[PDB]
Design a protein around this ligand. Structure first.
Ligand SMILES: C[C@H](N)C(=O)NS(=O)(=O)OC[C@H]1O[C@@H](n2cnc3c(N)ncnc32)[C@H](O)[C@@H]1O
Ligand SMILES: [Zn+2]
Ligand SMILES: [Zn+2]
Length: 738
């Protein structure tokens, strides 16, 4: 659908062709090349014959790339510090998949200023869409570093675009890594991801896709026909034009090494130790190389038949070959998965049964199972330390979160031991139920139930079911299909867009309890005003209540809500109010002064929690009433009664200390800079500016509720009780005041 001519192509005499195999547009400097350069159209042609002159380490290669764009003569890029793989700034993706995801949607919407323009970043990325490929294809990981130079072109203000991009890329490959310029190809394919799309180039070299360049000018939907489908979704054009690049670091370092897998090249410090521990034998070469070569020719969306095609090829039976490579697949996955695990846990992912947590856990189960398949009994946490020992030099937080990380593994590995036992029994029982029910195989669906609810991988369900004559049928793409199952998924509308924003008098003065305002509109029994001291529901804090005095009558405000920027007021007498009218409002103050205490107190508590429990602690939920308040956090073990006391004790020391509680609007990016992602506790607030409440040297938080000037005014905090809401979420209940 899109064009794809660049200056460079036109000037240096590239030819655009349609691949003989797949018919896709691609750009080659070589008039012979008939295929796109991408498997299965091409093979791996760099194993033992590296495609980059010298040998690079992960650390050299990263620093190379980073330096190149940072110091570039023509376009200098701003260097940006990598983001947590746990997307604290948004609510739509579970983990960080591409580097661009760091910048959706706020930066790409010009709602938030980019940290640089252009910018260069090395971004840890996690993709479970390829989890079944790890250890098989030799090129996929769960966790890899996407290196990227990004450029945000807001209207009437270019940085750079398509032409300059294919160049800075092509420069780096040839003038930095010294790649053979007529082995580079540029395949055309659009790229969609995390809310945006655009046409893109797949940079292909010697049989391995090493980079991807996206020219992003699209945003999703919403539910109205200047639309374009990019990958079976709907987009409309967008104001910004963004340069989305993605450079496979691992893939490049593999290239400068020619080892049999990218894993041997990047994850040596884990793979080779593990080979000794398994006592596995250094595989036959005429077997190893004639499998290493053909490995890139098969993905899964039927691995069986590749196995027969390398069997026939090399000269042996499938089992004979299975025997040979199988241990290597397992070692690679373990090495990989456990690195994914190190990055997630350090970024405060707490294993559980939902969202990111679910994933960490999945990863842990698959790992343990592989260790058991290799007949190894080294604890998982020991593998993980190898990753910490190695990476804590470049990633300082791995050493800082090291105890929480290791400990978290321990407990999950303990818990698995038992979950297996009772699960094995529970499944066998309800399989024996099915043999007689007349079922000889076990559907995929049921196999996914057995993981979802019992915690059993199907390498376990297949044996248990065969020691009773039902069949071992594991889909190749199982684990990725399981990873999909990690997420799920009103009062007044319409007549509101035309009305102005409601002035929020509670933000100017939280102690304001009386005010006057003009009745802007009276839909149903909801009254709209221009300005209001009534705090609408949201934040964990419930609505304010009180009276609106109108023509000398008191009318009760029973509910205050907020649609968009317009706050609605449920009254008892919709008749008594007319558009135009001037009303005197009075807040039910007691109810409010109580709420503020439970609010401020929640932040004081939040501070204490982090200080005892540690850094992984993040709001999972909040509810307060005038009486008690509750704060669900994300934690792994139970909060002991000795801790519960230390938390409460520290909290009360701060209420005693009477520290300043101060709030101020800040542009999103300055805010995230000054204070880090901690600000995004409960929720992720929209808009160009955010309200930052801070308690002096204690807590800081993008929060929109009404607070108190000073902690003294909270009064003592009695922690009533802690309790476990679900895996990874514990709950602290308490009540403040006199
Ligand atoms: C830039 C665009 N947003 C993007 O992320 N495209 S991409 O999906 O193709 O990723 C860019 C590069 O990251 C690397 N990459 C993608 N998936 C990978 C995986 N599973 N393992 C290792 N590297 C991967 C590849 O080198 C790829 O060329
Ligand atoms: Zn092709
Ligand atoms: Zn708050």
């Amino acid at each position: 659908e899109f064009i794809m001519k660049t200056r460079m192509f036109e000037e240096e005499g590239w030819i655009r062709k349609k691949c003989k195999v797949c018919g896709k547009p691609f750009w080659t400097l070589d008039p012979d090349r008939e295929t796109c350069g991408d498997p299965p159209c091409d093979e791996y042609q760099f194993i033992g014959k590296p495609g980059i002159p010298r040998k690079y380490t992960l650390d050299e290669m990263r620093e190379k790339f980073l330096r190149f764009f940072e110091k570039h003569e023509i376009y200098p890029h701003g260097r940006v510090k990598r983001y947590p793989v746990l997307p604290r700034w948004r609510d739509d993706v579970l983990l960080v998949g591409a580097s661009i995801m760091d910048f959706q949607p706020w930066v790409i919407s010009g709602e938030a200023d980019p940290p640089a323009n252009p910018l260069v970043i090395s971004q840890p990325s996690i993709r479970f869409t390829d989890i079944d490929n790890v250890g098989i294809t030799g090129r996929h990981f769960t966790i890899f570093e996407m290196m990227a130079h990004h450029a945000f072109n807001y209207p009437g203000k270019p940085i750079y675009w398509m032409d300059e991009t294919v160049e800075l890329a092509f420069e780096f490959f040839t003038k930095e890594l010294k790649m053979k310029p007529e082995d580079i190809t540029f395949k055309e394919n659009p790229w969609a991801g995390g809310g945006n799309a655009g046409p893109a180039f797949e940079v292909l070299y010697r049989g391995l896709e090493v980079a991807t360049l996206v020219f992003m000018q699209y945003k999703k939907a919403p539910e109205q026909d200047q639309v374009v489908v990019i990958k079976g979704e709907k987009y409309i054009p967008m104001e910004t034009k963004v340069v989305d690049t993605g450079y496979g670091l691992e893939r490049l370092v593999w290239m400068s090494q020619g080892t049999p897998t990218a894993y041997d090249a990047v994850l040596g410090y884990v793979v080779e130790p593990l080979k000794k521990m398994a006592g596995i034998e250094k595989i036959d070469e005429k077997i190893l190389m004639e499998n290493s070569r053909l490995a890139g020719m098969f993905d899964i969306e039927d691995l069986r038949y590749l196995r027969e095609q390398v069997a026939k090829r090399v000269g042996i039976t499938v089992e004979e070959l299975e025997k040979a490579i199988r241990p290597y697949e397992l070692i690679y996955a373990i090495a990989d998965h456990t690195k994914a695990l190190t990055f997630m846990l350090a970024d405060g992912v707490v294993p559980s049964n939902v969202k990111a947590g679910y994933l960490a856990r999945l990863l842990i189960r698959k790992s343990i199972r592989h260790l058991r398949e290799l007949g190894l009994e080294v604890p998982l946490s020991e593998i993980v330390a190898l990753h910490i020992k190695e990476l804590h030099k470049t990633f300082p937080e791995f050493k800082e979160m090291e105890d929480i990380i290791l400990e978290m593994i321990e407990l999950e590995e303990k818990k698995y031991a038992e979950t297996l036992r009772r699960g094995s029994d529970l499944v066998r029982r309800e399989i024996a139920k099915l043999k007689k029910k007349g079922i000889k195989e076990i559907p995929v669906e049921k196999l996914v139930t057995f993981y979802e609810s019992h915690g059993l991988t199907p390498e376990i369900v297949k044996e248990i079911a065969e020691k009773e004559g039902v069949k071992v049928n594991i889909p190749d793409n199982f684990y990725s299909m399981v990873a999909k199952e990690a997420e799920r998924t009103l009062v007044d509308f319409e007549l509101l867009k035309d009305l102005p924003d409601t002035r929020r008098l509670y933000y100017e003065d939280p102690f304001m309890k009386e005010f006057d305002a003009k009745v802007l509109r009276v839909i149903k029994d909801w009254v709209i005003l221009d300005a209001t001291a009534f705090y609408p529901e949201g934040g964990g804090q419930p609505y304010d209540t009180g009276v609106l005095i109108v023509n000398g009558r008191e009318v009760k405000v029973t509910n205050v809500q907020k649609v968009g920027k317009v706050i609605i007021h449920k009254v008892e007498d919709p008749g008594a109010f007319k558009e135009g009218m001037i009303v005197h409002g009075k807040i039910d103050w007691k109810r409010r002064i109580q709420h503020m205490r439970h609010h401020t107190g929640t932040h004081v508590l939040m501070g204490a929690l982090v200080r005892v429990l540690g850094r992984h602690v993040w709001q999972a939920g909040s509810q307060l009433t005038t009486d008690w308040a509750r704060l669900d956090i994300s934690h792994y073990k139970r909060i002991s009664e000795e801790e519960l006391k230390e938390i409460e004790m520290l909290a009360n020391r701060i209420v005693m200390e009477d520290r300043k509680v101060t709030w101020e609007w800040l542009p999103r990016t300055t805010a995230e800079q000054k204070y880090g992602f901690r600000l995004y506790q409960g929720g992720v607030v929209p808009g160009r500016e955010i309200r930052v409440v801070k308690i002096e040297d204690w807590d800081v938080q993008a929060c929109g509720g009404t607070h108190l000037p000073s902690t003294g005014l909270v009064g003592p905090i009695k922690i009533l009780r802690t309790e476990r809401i679900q895996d990874g979420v514990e709950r602290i209940i308490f009540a403040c005041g006199e």
